[PDB]
Amino acid sequence: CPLMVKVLDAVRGSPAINVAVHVFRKAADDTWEPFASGKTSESGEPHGLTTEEEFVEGIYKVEIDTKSYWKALGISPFHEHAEVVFTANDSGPRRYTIAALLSPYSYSTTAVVTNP
Amino acid sequence: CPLMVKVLDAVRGSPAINVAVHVFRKAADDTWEPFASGKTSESGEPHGLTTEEEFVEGIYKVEIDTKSYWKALGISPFHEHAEVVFTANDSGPRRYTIAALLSPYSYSTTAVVTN
Amino acid sequence: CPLMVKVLDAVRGSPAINVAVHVFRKAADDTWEPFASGKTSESGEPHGLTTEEEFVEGIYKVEIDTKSYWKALGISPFHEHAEVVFTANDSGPRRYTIAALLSPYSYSTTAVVTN
Amino acid sequence: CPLMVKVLDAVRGSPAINVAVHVFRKAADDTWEPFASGKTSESGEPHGLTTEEEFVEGIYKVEIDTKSYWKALGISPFHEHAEVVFTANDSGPRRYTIAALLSPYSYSTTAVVTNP
């Protein structure tokens, strides 16, 4: 898995489960193209988003549907979503882990990039 | 201003100065429209982004040019920029501060909504 | 004040009000000695913790009573408190702000040191 | 491993490697007693800090030597260390993961608590 996403809930101290994760790539024509999507499992990760063959150099956008998560728990959050935009692999293939820590009025995002 | 932005540099322990901040509003066509922009001052805030008569309810996007900021410091960054997308609701208090804490491979954003 | 503390509540999107903040200094005997304390006001800051003549170089500890704060909100917290331990150096700028962002199972702390 | 610690470096986008982790328990006499210690591996985790038998109810302190980490990389950080103090297992045994995200003038700490 060259692109892994891990989502945590800072209010409950648990993995954020059943959260939708949508990934887009920037296309030749400056639009975002759908690339991959999934839902976080009990571990807070969507398993198998992409492959090493498919995950080529490019600008990627990872959108995490935090609004639907907090609403399904009865909280009206501040953010519409949490997005992470980055250039990938432009020095060769890497494995990326995007971690997102969620609160109703706050989120943080961190990337860990390791040589595959 | 009913909308303030405050940007901090976690590597140097200072306000993030001279960072471009762009604000968009969501229009009927589900496309973003330029609304406000500014450069952070030495306090890490771009002074006077908007006013309470233009800042009506709706969905707003705040884009912080983090990549240019880290490039000016000679530090390689992960993110292309930091974006904050939110709904402003009148029922809620009357002033929004979006705080952003920046590191090269991490950022956090927080909304402080005060009456 | 050469030392300010600012405490934010990430769950409610407001300053964390009425939070106890205790400051200690490290003494020769490697034991902490009470130095300053206060309760955060409605801005999330305990006004006037110290002065520039008492705030000499040394190692300081800032303890924020997060557990009492979350208990008052009826929200079960992980941490017993949040502590920030640091060295104040004159060579460094002349005002310290320790910012703390609180959630029940997470907190982050940041030092903004300005001239 | 009922107590796991994961340390990340927000400047380099990598696990924080070779970081010392010291764990103490609060003793009957109100002093901190040494309970366990280790160094983070290439994954940013110290492996095998404690056991389920040893990790009883109590107040625990996890100290992460962040100062030595940043100094070994040529940075003078703000914090002397990052500490996490919490009550453990007081509702029955749990597995705790303490994550710490490190910058020179900032750190964050998050706990994920899962039923064993």
Interruption sites in chain B after residues (C→N beyond 2.5 Å): none
B2 token code pair: 């009913």
The experimental technique used to determine this model is X-ray
Task: Determine which helix (DSSP H) or strand (DSSP E) holds D32, and give its type and residue range.
Answer: strand D32-39
Per the structure, the complete domain to which residue C18 belongs is given by 1-115
Question: CB–CB of A79/A68 below 8 Å?
Answer: no
D72/C100 Cα distance (integer angstroms): 26
Say which DSSP state C30 is in.
S
Option in B80, B84, B113 nearest A85 (CB): B80
Residues of A in contact with B108 (CB under 8 A): 101, 106-109
With H, G, I as helix, E, B as strand and everything else as coil, classify residue B2: coil
D18: alpha, beta or left? (left if phi > 0; alpha if psi -120 to 50): left
A93/A97 Cα distance (integer angstroms): 13
Task: Name the residue type at position A87.
Answer: T
In the sheet with B95-103, reading across from the earlier edge strand, the strands are A14-15, A3-9, A95-103, A106-114, B106-114, B95-103, B3-9, B14-15
With H, G, I as helix, E, B as strand and everything else as coil, classify residue A29: coil
Chain D nearest CA to A12, separation (Å): 8
Beta carbons of C85 and D80 less than 8 Å apart: yes
Closest chain D CA to residue C88: D78
What are the Cα distances from residue A58, in Å, to A31, A52, C10, D19? 13, 13, 33, 33
With H, G, I as helix, E, B as strand and everything else as coil, classify residue A66: helix
For D29, residues 6+ apart whose C-beta sits below 8 A from its C-beta are none
For every residue of B18-40, DSSP letters joined together read T-EEEEEEE-TTS-EEEEEEEE-
Half-sphere exposure for A65 (CA within 13 Å, toward CB):
16
CA C7 to chain centre: 8
For C84, residues 6+ apart whose C-beta sits below 8 A from its C-beta are C61, C62, C64, C98, C100, C109, C111, D79
B83 token code pair: 């974006």
In chain A, the DSSP E strands lie at 3-9, 14-15, 20-26, 32-39, 58-64, 82-88, 95-103, 106-114
Burial letters D47-58, b for 16+ CB under 10 A, else e? eebbeeeebeeb
B34/B60 Cα distance (integer angstroms): 10
D48/A93 Cα distance (integer angstroms): 32
What are the Cα distances from residue C100, in Å, to A81, B22, B25, D28? 23, 26, 30, 31
B76/B93 Cα distance (integer angstroms): 38
Domain count, chain B: 1
With H, G, I as helix, E, B as strand and everything else as coil, classify residue B68: helix
With H, G, I as helix, E, B as strand and everything else as coil, classify residue D71: helix
Strands A14-15, A3-9: pairing kind: antiparallel
Question: CB–CB of B20/B111 below 8 Å?
Answer: no
C55 phi, psi to nearest 5 deg = -90, 75
Alpha helical stretches, state H, A3-82? 66-72
Burial letters B14-40, b for 16+ CB under 10 A, else e? bbbbebbbbbbbbeeeeebeebbebeb
C95 token code pair: 């005002």
Strands D95-103, D82-88: pairing kind: unpaired
Choose among A85, A93, A95: nearest CA to A2. Answer: A95
A50/A3 Cα distance (integer angstroms): 7
In the sheet with C20-26, reading across from the earlier edge strand, the strands are C32-39, C20-26, C58-64, C82-88
A10 token code pair: 């800072």
Residues of A in contact with B85 (CB under 8 A): 79-81, 83
What are the Cα distances from residue B82, in Å, to A58, C25, C38? 18, 37, 35
Select from C66, C70, C73, C105 the residue whose CB has the most chain A CBs within 10 Å, as the one to mutate to test that interface: C105
Question: CB–CB of B102/B71 below 8 Å?
Answer: no
Residues of B in contact with D105 (CB under 8 A): 9-13
Chain B nearest CA to A104, separation (Å): 9
Task: Name the residue type at position B99.
Answer: A
- Compute the radius of gyration of chain C from its Cα atoms: 14
Say which DSSP state A115 is in.
-
Q: Would you give the end-to-end CA distance of chain C in angstroms?
A: 12
Give the sign of the dihedral formed by CA C46, CA B86, CA B88, CA B47: positive
Beta carbons of B99 and C8 less than 8 Å apart: yes
Query: Residue B78's domain is classified under what CATH number?
Result: 2.60.40.180
